[PDB]
Amino acid sequence: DVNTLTRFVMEEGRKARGTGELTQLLNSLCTAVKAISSAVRKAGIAHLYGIAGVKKLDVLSNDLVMNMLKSSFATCVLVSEEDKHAIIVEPEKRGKYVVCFDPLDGSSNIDCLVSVGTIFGIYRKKSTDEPSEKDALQPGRNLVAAGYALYGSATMLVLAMDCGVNCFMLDPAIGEFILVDKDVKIKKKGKIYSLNEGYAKDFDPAVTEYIQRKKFPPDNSAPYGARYVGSMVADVHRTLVYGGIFLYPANKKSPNGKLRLLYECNPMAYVMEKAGGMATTGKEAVLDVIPTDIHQRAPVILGSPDDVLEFLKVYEKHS
Amino acid sequence: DVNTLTRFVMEEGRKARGTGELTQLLNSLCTAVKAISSAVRKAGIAHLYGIAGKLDVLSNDLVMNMLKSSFATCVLVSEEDKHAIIVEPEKRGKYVVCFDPLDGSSNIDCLVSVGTIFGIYRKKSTDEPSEKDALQPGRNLVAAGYALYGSATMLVLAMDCGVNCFMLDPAIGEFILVDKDVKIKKKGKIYSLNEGYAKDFDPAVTEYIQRKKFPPDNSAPYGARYVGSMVADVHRTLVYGGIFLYPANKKSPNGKLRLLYECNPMAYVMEKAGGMATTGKEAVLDVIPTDIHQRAPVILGSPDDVLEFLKVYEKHS
Amino acid sequence: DVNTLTRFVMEEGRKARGTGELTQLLNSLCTAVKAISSAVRKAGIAHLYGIAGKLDVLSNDLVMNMLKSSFATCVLVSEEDKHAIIVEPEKRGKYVVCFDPLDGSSNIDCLVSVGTIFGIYRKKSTDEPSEKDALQPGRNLVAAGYALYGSATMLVLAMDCGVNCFMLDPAIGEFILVDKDVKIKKKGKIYSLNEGYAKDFDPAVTEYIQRKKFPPDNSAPYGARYVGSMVADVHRTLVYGGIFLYPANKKSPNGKLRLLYECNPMAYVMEKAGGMATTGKEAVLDVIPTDIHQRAPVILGSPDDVLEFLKVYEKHS
Amino acid sequence: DVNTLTRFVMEEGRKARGTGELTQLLNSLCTAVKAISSAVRKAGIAHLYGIAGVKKLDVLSNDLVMNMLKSSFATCVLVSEEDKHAIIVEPEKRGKYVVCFDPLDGSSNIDCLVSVGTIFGIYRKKSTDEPSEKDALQPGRNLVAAGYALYGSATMLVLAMDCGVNCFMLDPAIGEFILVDKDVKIKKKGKIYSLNEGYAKDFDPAVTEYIQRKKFPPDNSAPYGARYVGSMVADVHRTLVYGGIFLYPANKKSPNGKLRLLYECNPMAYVMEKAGGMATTGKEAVLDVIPTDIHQRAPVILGSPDDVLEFLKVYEKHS
Numbered sequence A, D: 001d002v003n004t005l006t007r008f009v010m011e012e013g014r015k016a017r018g019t020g021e022l023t024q025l026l027n028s029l030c031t032a033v034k035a036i037s038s039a040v041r042k043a044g045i046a047h048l049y050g051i052a053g054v055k056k057l058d059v060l061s062n063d064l065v066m067n068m069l070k071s072s073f074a075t076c077v078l079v080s081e082e083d084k085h086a087i088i089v090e091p092e093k094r095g096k097y098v099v100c101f102d103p104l105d106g107s108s109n110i111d112c113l114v115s116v117g118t119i120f121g122i123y124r125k126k127s128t129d130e131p132s133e134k135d136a137l138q139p140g141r142n143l144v145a146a147g148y149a150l151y152g153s154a155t156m157l158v159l160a161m162d163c164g165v166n167c168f169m170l171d172p173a174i175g176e177f178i179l180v181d182k183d184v185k186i187k188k189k190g191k192i193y194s195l196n197e198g199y200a201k202d203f204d205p206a207v208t209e210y211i212q213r214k215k216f217p218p219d220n221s222a223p224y225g226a227r228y229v230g231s232m233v234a235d236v237h238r239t240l241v242y243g244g245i246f247l248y249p250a251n252k253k254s255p256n257g258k259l260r261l262l263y264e265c266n267p268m269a270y271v272m273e274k275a276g277g278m279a280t281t282g283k284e285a286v287l288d289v290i291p292t293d294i295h296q297r298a299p300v301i302l303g304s305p306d307d308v309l310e311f312l313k314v315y316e317k318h319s
Numbered sequence B, C: 001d002v003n004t005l006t007r008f009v010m011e012e013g014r015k016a017r018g019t020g021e022l023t024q025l026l027n028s029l030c031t032a033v034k035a036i037s038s039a040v041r042k043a044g045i046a047h048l049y050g051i052a053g054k055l056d057v058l059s060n061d062l063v064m065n066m067l068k069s070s071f072a073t074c075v076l077v078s079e080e081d082k083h084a085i086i087v088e089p090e091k092r093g094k095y096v097v098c099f100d101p102l103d104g105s106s107n108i109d110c111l112v113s114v115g116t117i118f119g120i121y122r123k124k125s126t127d128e129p130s131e132k133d134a135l136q137p138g139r140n141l142v143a144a145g146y147a148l149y150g151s152a153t154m155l156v157l158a159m160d161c162g163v164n165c166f167m168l169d170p171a172i173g174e175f176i177l178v179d180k181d182v183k184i185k186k187k188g189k190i191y192s193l194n195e196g197y198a199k200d201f202d203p204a205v206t207e208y209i210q211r212k213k214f215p216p217d218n219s220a221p222y223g224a225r226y227v228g229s230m231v232a233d234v235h236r237t238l239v240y241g242g243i244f245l246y247p248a249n250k251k252s253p254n255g256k257l258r259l260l261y262e263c264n265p266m267a268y269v270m271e272k273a274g275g276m277a278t279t280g281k282e283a284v285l286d287v288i289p290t291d292i293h294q295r296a297p298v299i300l301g302s303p304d305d306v307l308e309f310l311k312v313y314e315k316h317s
């Protein structure tokens, strides 16, 4: 039987007898994602180039997510890559969830039409205090749902919850996210490694040795292939689909890495763990880091568990 | 003034007082590309999954049928077809087209960018049309380019007048001219290759990549990007500058990419944009092919980067 | 604040603390309507005409399959099906839906506006569901409305909270709330019927129409409009006011339009918008049906217009 | 073999060894029609209603046709329902054709989502004078091409030339007009009449009798059906497809009718004649009226020849 994202979530919600607020949030998020997809694919660009005689994509994407979530009546605190401070939803619109998101990840290189994406993580507000930026400082372990929209060769929404990870393809003919992969699990071990090797001169010695083993295996196994889109959503999604390992690790110049914990590392860590994968900073699971700043950075190494465990073996060798 | 692909080509064609055949070919190709884009973005996927109760093959059929019915072609070479396709006599025209209808589709399971690559030749021999008509060096190309099905769909068209970039507006199904007479940066800051073959690299590639990571002149190291889909990687090289490499390795001793419908079209785009494209030993466009699916090593991109690689290549004889 | 169909319905349902079954129903039907709109606008027609080398039946399949799989329905009555469809046991919910999946499609050859009409009832007994559950008077309707596939696609939804109009935005596949809690004009200036059947008119219809063309009170004559597709004509009546008639005559004592999935949903929309809908003898919503495909006369629209017609009808006993 | 509008016109042009200017014009007009269709179907309406936190359609349609034709390098004089004076294309953009068009016919009732359309008629400039409004004052007999786009349940472009009338369906998934009905001809006699009978009180006596014969045939044969969308392009297209008669006739209050000769009546008259139908004012062929004002009105009666002849017989009975 055919299934859609909204029908799927409604069915899960009715099973669990939830109030519907999470369903309202996710449906609102999906409307935003469809509007982002339409703009990213450049519908209406003819009008910008004078066919009859405004916002940058990252600003528009942020406004779409912000406005659809504010008006969902399901959220109270919103953290965006785009905004220095947490956004507090006005009282008459307040609901129970905190949402951290990157509305258009990878858009810095969108001039070359690289895949881009939207990343989100949804938390339940934990106290009855007046909503504040502190409501977003939860460890990823507290996530209620997380995932990403990938605006690639097609548009796909990957949604992770306690019930697992499910993948929905946007059918642009009808504007519906169609369930096409149910309860997906990552391969126990992959054959692809993904990181920016151009910065090898700055690598931590453990990263240098680990990548060297992928290219020059000590036994007679085949060396790993390399892929690095440079857009986190594309690279993580390939890691999910094909297995393997993705790294944006710490080094001496960047002791906490470069990617943002709240709306890049944690949601992808959560997707990976719900798919049977792993996500580490090198020192601990990404989902166990307790944040102190909504824009703080974190190292991240994630993907197939055998690959992440092997990296942890090499990392500990240099510790 | 706004411009579209078809209007651009008609205006160029009328200035040169051509017969119109190339315009008919390219307009037919653009129709196929729009249908490929629609399928790649999964329009109608709900019907496959039961709402009412093969992509590379479809892409090949769209290009083949649209090019056959244009009356502008006589010989068609596709990555999907073991032998050259000979257009039936009543539909025969003067052009030969080599193409990859959906380049990179082996990894489309992960929604990697994909694309269509094409190169267009005038039939040069007066013999009955056959597979040998597609065996001309890339230097003979009349037009070449690619459609990139990325975050948006863009058609890059290279001709003697230069390189022009057209964005597909899906709201109206029109390719809009957005970048005119494009030129690649003289030198870039990104290198692109599958470093997983580092064990098999010849010493020239090994040294060149080492120079990118550990620059001898204390300059900033290059960043690395490798999508693994040639159209995406080459299009980034065009837009941002830098260098793309797919050298030979033990699995691919004559290289991996196909000369006729991957290396030559991209090499032609690069050269028309003021860039370079070499096998290491010679310009890609000077290779005289003997087999329609033969492979070639390729290094291409910004001229200062390709020249720097060639200096390293010369150091190793 | 922007609003969409699914979000609007979820919010009403949560206020009323409903179980969610009606929302699952309406969301599934919306998915079907978007697939119907896409096919009606001929998306993909190039493939039927050979680029790579039924509509009313497809529409029925879309509605049937989305409602069956909604887990919200148990009995489905369609203009397309001789008997009621009984939803298979594991998929059963409490609602009965009568619908016309592509009303007006007999004239779709000329691209006349077409539409989907629906009315939703609660199951009548806890017995095994059967066709008898569809034999309720329109007064029992829980929700009703229509999608109009016109110059744009619009879904009109009537419930106890009133009538709301949602425009399909094809760029994102979302129904946008654009007209809230609509009320029809008290009196219009347009009458709508097939005057080609004047020879068969009941004398009251003849007299009423004469008053529209030759007003006794020296007011302006009404304009005439008759698309011949019920959804288009009824939607114009809602938006602009006036009167729509498909009345009984001596040859068709019960009219031509179907009571369960044409007249009742439109009468319910009309009454929720402050208009009226009569057979001439009684309110459409008060007819108790005995056959799921039975016909009904219908006169509907602005209250002053319908009351004026009813006064003429009473004049002729 | 599949055929599209642009491919069809290129092939006719190459056969006849034309210069290509008419093809550039028609291709430019097609681009405008696709943009009008997208706006008429309300693509992007979510943005007007606040999804992220402007012109009327008839104004936008006029700007689209005007700008695409100006920039086609194929035109010198443009007459539009929207503009009091003819537009004279600036010298650097001038071509040889004069175009009269109604960019969005029927839009007065678009609030109720009635079918609307674009009507066009194309003339060759006849004089060697500097271009002026006078170049648009040619009788419809001089038309080089004419037709219309109907934005109905689907979008269709009907194109009439000397080779006949051809119908192209817009496939929105790919933005191409697909040839679906070749060399179309109207029925010799139909069963539907089309006019606003609400104004019967003001009818010319000939119109009153003809309509009386349709509803009460003297031979007791079956009456005609009635249809009147009130949007000229919708009513005329149904007349072409199903046969019958469409009337917007003269009366004493409107002795020249109300529809406009240059960009409504002539193009529809030209399509009808190329399809083997008829189009009369009552007194003369629509295509033979020599206009003196670019916005002058004409009565029009058109459709199946046997139906138009019967109207003309009744019209003459009433001298």
Ligand SMILES: O=C(Nc1ncc(Br)s1)NS(=O)(=O)c1csc2ccccc12
Binding pocket: A009, A010, A011, A012, A013, A014, A016, A017, A018, A019, A020, A021, A022, A023, A024, A161, C019, C020, C021, C023, C024
């Ligand atoms: O949505 C609902 N209930 C509904 N009742 C009627 C309709 Br219709 S949906 N609950 S929830 O929003 O909390 C929710 C959405 S997924 C999920 C998974 C586990 C637990 C709860 C949830």
Ligand SMILES: O=C(Nc1ncc(Br)s1)NS(=O)(=O)c1csc2ccccc12
Binding pocket: B009, B010, B011, B012, B013, B014, B016, B017, B018, B019, B020, B021, B022, B023, B024, D019, D020, D021, D023, D024
């Ligand atoms: O298209 C035409 N002629 C036309 N006449 C009327 C119309 Br309308 S198009 N010629 S061509 O096909 O050879 C062509 C297409 S780009 C280009 C660039 C250089 C030389 C020739 C060409």
Ligand SMILES: O=C(Nc1ncc(Br)s1)NS(=O)(=O)c1csc2ccccc12
Binding pocket: A019, A020, A021, A023, A024, C009, C010, C011, C012, C013, C014, C016, C017, C018, C019, C020, C021, C022, C023, C024, C159
């Ligand atoms: O949908 C729900 N409740 C929901 N809970 C959570 C989510 Br999320 S939706 N109830 S209902 O289906 O009966 C319904 C839909 S409109 C309407 C109007 C009046 C009464 C009931 C209804």
Ligand SMILES: O=C(Nc1ncc(Br)s1)NS(=O)(=O)c1csc2ccccc12
Binding pocket: B019, B020, B021, B023, B024, D009, D010, D011, D012, D013, D014, D016, D017, D018, D019, D020, D021, D022, D023, D024
């Ligand atoms: O377009 C062309 N010639 C072309 N050359 C190359 C290409 Br490619 S098209 N001629 S025309 O514009 O005058 C034209 C368009 S339909 C038609 C019908 C009859 C006579 C002329 C025409």
